[PDB]
Amino acid sequence: SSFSQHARTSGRVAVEEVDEEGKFVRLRNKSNEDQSMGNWQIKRQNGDDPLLTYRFPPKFTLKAGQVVTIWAAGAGATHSPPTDLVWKAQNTWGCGNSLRTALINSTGEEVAMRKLVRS
DNA sequence: GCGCGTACGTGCGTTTAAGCGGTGCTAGAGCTGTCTACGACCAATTGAGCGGCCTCGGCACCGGATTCTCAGGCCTGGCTCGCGATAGGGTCCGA
């Protein structure tokens, strides 16, 4: 796939899938309990590109075993909570050989991260 | 909680040794008659050994080096980033 994926998780939510073209960001709650992700921050790093910061609404909770996918403006997807959300303020999550998607909670702590590395 | 890859579960054909039966006997477990060395027990011995005192000394306890260990900072090598060269692809042009 030419993009190595590094998965690390210390909480309940893991970064399930990252789009190489930056169309969407997919996270998974692999525990057996619902995770409240109110005002959690998603920071996307594309190599040396400036950070794109996405902020969730003040009250948001992902049910256990459910999938929420954050789509970009250029993707053309339709938001449908609690499973589908679209970030119209950003045309695309970006591209590059070093794509890093870090999930930041409301306390500014990194609990999940997945990095796409291409030789 | 993330992964994996290799070690164990599942399956199944194979056989080969487990299980079944049946035999003979004699090795040895068991039982009975004898008596003979084995052990108990009591009187005296007596001295073996137990019970309180003197010492002295192995050992304990306090003070301060001495060697040790623990902890933290700066320098050098391992490492890496990067420009420009001679080998390979390819061309022809002789006959």
Report the nucleotide nearest the CA of residue A11, measured to C1'.
Answer: B1
Q: Is A113 helix (H, G, I), strand (E, B) or coil?
A: strand
A32/B67 CA-to-C1' distance in Å: 60
Q: Rounded to whole angstroms, how far apart are CA atoms A46 and A98?
A: 6
Total residues belonging to chain A: 119
Report the nucleotide nearest the CA of residue A15, measured to C1'.
Answer: B2
Q: Rounded to whole angstroms, how far apart are CA atoms A63 and A47?
A: 32
Report the nucleotide nearest the CA of residue A12, measured to C1'.
Answer: B1
Resolution in A: 7.1
Cβ(A37)–Cβ(A85) below 8 Å: no
A30 touches strand B (CB under 7 A): yes
- CA quadruple A56, A20, A79, A10: dihedral positive or negative? negative
A56/B95 CA-to-C1' distance in Å: 82
